[PDB]
A paper describes a structure:
In this study, we have identified a new specific binding partner of M. smegmatis σA, MoaB2, that appears not to interact with alternative σ factors. MoaB2 is a 17.9 kDa (pI 4.17) protein of unknown function. Functional experiments then showed that MoaB2 inhibits σA-dependent (but not σB-dependent) transcription and may increase the stability of σA in the cell. Likewise, the role of M. smegmatis MoaB2 in Moco biosynthesis is unlikely, especially when M. smegmatis MoaB2 contains serine at the respective position (Ser51).
In the crystal, MoaB2 was present as a hexamer. In crystal, the M. smegmatis MoaB2 hexamer forms the asymmetric unit. Each subunit of the hexamer exhibited a weak or missing electron density for the N-terminal residues 1–7, the C-terminal His-tag, and linker residues from the plasmid. The structure of each subunit of M. smegmatis MoaB2 is composed of a central β-sheet that is slightly curved and is surrounded by six α-helices and one 310 helix. The β-sheet is made up of five parallel strands (β1–β4 and β6) and one antiparallel strand (β5), which are located between the inner β4 strand and the adjacent β6 strand. The overall architecture of the protein subunit is similar to other known molybdopterin (MPT)-adenylyl-transferase enzymes. The hexamers are made up of two trimers (chains ABC and DEF) making contacts through mostly hydrophobic and salt-bridge interactions at the interface between the subunits. Assembly of subunits into trimers within the hexamer is strengthened through several hydrogen bonds between Arg95 and Arg120 of one monomer and Val79, Thr80, and Pro81 of another monomer. Residues Leu31, Glu34, and Glu38 in α4-helix and Arg138 and Arg142 in α7-helix form the central core of the trimer-trimer interface. Calculations using the Adaptive Poisson-Boltzmann Solver showed that the electrostatic potential on the surface of M. smegmatis MoaB2 is prominently negative.
Author numbering:
A (entry chain A): 8 to 17, 26 to 158
B (entry chain F): 7 to 21, 23 to 159
C (entry chain E): 7 to 22, 24 to 158
D (entry chain D): 7 to 22, 24 to 148, 150 to 158
E (entry chain C): 7 to 17, 27 to 159
F (entry chain B): 7 to 160
Write the structure that this text describes.
Amino acid sequence: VGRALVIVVDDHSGPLVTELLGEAGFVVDGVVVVASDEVEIRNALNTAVIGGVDLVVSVGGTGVTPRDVTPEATRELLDRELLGISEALRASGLAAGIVDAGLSRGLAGISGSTLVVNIAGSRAAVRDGMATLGPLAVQIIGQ
Amino acid sequence: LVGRALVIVVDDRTAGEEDHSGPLVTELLGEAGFVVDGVVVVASDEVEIRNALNTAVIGGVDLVVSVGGTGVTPRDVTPEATRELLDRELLGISEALRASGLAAGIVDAGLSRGLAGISGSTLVVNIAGSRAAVRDGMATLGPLAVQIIGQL
Amino acid sequence: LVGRALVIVVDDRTAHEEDHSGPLVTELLGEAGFVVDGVVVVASDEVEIRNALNTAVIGGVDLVVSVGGTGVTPRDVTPEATRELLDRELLGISEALRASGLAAGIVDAGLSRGLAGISGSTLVVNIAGSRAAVRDGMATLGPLAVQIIGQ
Amino acid sequence: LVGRALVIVVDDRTAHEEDHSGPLVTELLGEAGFVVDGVVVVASDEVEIRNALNTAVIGGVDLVVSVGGTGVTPRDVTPEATRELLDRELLGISEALRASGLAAGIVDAGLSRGLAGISGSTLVVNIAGSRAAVRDGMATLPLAVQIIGQ
Amino acid sequence: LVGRALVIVVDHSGPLVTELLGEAGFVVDGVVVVASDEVEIRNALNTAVIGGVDLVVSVGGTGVTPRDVTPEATRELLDRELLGISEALRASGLAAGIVDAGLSRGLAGISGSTLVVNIAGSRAAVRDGMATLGPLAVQIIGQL
Amino acid sequence: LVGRALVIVVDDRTAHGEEDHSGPLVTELLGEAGFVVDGVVVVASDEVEIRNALNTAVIGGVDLVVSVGGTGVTPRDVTPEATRELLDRELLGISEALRASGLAAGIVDAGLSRGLAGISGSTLVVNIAGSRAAVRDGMATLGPLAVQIIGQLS
């Protein structure tokens, strides 16, 4: 229980992430859409951390093509990394047969007091990714 | 597209407070490429479920999906209602589901007594009632059903 | 106190040598919130196992965990001593255990033919006999048995 | 090393065309430490399959592996063929294979209705028919060596 | 049978880690207790490595809180990292419902010829971790 | 054709004379996964030599390089260190899947492999462990993942 922001990298994801975040027990302060620009994405994350949200979910920008800069945007902001979250989403993704989730370069970790998690872009990856993530997020905001 | 489906919501309160499962199953079956022909609500009652099921198979459907009544209490009797209808168990479905659920921490999906099988030419699958379990089972079921209804 | 438990240890040696599995099951069960009322040692004989199991369900206990006699040899007869008194099979417990065991490298847990199920209002689970299988089974069983006792 | 095995290929095409699975199964059974007595081929028929399984249990072999006939189509009768012959079901084998195949994205392994168990003193295991399913099935099946150990 | 181990507890777990390493095939030379202080931990690990023990298991200090510094303390000691061990423990943890193991920032790796492994603090994590780690440790101690 | 693949076999004994049992098998399995195999390069378990073979294979433009061996934990196992120099981006997900699949199947060298996966230039590079069991399990898990990576890169 806390409050959370969504960041779509340009999607149908924003309303859906809002919904699943809602069911996980989160107030969704809003949806911010940004381009696959490392600076535009980093600016959006940093701004959110400073603003004191408990949780920031990004969606998209985690595949292999050079336009996919979500991870490297994110890494500058992380005080500590939570591979546990990255591994659980990827593991879960493959199991379900969702490959962009299986192969995601998304990070997870803590910036200030905020948990940041990068989820992959496809609808399947958002569903499976929130299902898995929501519990783990809850436990971490608990510190 | 892929096919048609009928959704049975096994719940006493729903049979008549508001159905949440039924819309949700429909939304998710839609993304997998199914049209839901209908949502039938029914009490945790062995016969009522068996009839609902039997009627769906009889009717023009490729996929039947029950939600609820898969637990352990006296009144969870969806598996009992479902067994005679099967011609051939699909244990990999029950297992894929039970395992996905457990992996995700959803003990009612994880511990579901729910079955899976062909009843004639129709895929029947029982799913557990919790929202988490509907969301996970469907994510797991959709591709599996897509490939079973194709080999038929 | 989440509920009470009886332990049945299925081992010839023990029946005819000191019991290692039973104190262990009890430690592990008591971490998951259970109190073990007793350990009952029996031999790998269909009849003995079944009588002990029925006497447990007749003791009214919340959980009965057998240990041993789930393998393939002709004397591993725990599963068939147990089937007759289940009103409902709980495959997802049996599947969870074998899956967990298999992933830990514990082949006897991995391939156990041990059943799980409800007998009246009593949860009944059969676990393989190695110390490894006992330790991994109870970790995996503890939570599931807590929730099922919700009933 | 470990024991002797016989391979039954279930495939109409092959029973009427070069067998693809038989040599592969033999190959992998070898790496797992089995001598293969050889490959019986068999049309996708309940009774014909059943008798080849019978023949093999009676014929003394430690492991019988079936390939194919595990799907949902009507001619997929290998499970029906196999069940009257088991004295003891080993669901944890069926379970492991299914779980492994589905984990690897192999849907005919993942959903296979193939059975596994002990008939007399023989380990019998039905594996699904696709090439991917054979490789994953056999790499998972080690469980074989354990079980023949007793 | 197989090798010598040292337990570092970051402040219950000591006797338990001892018991389970035992069953895994490991003599336990000692149990060192340490106070959640990057410096203290790194030194206990230094000492453990320098004395040539085969396996060092640390317990605790792997969560997200300010004073969870066990990973920071271990990183510079690792010659080679072994994510497969960390992955196996985290995945095992998660499957078993044990979130502290599931989300543990704990590392695994080789320092000198010593296998070092950070396990999370909860009793369940120690049990799940040790059951998983045991055979992995045995195999690595073989190839070293 | 999904693409071209190259096999690098990292094994001192193979390098110093002995028959290569790993290289043909990876050729077959890549065949089935959908790849034409440009050939097999054998290398000793030396970081330079290995780095040089990967670097040459990348610049030559194959879609996929699989290496075999040198992922363990002896001093000699330097495939990861060689590979790391060359990666523009890591696909931790591929390594996680191979380790996870290995462990489940009881194949501990796959389980514990320090293998990397990643993108070098426009080449998918993946280190697999050297055991015969690890090569079979590795290629099975990898084949489809690599199909989907080549396609995102074209």
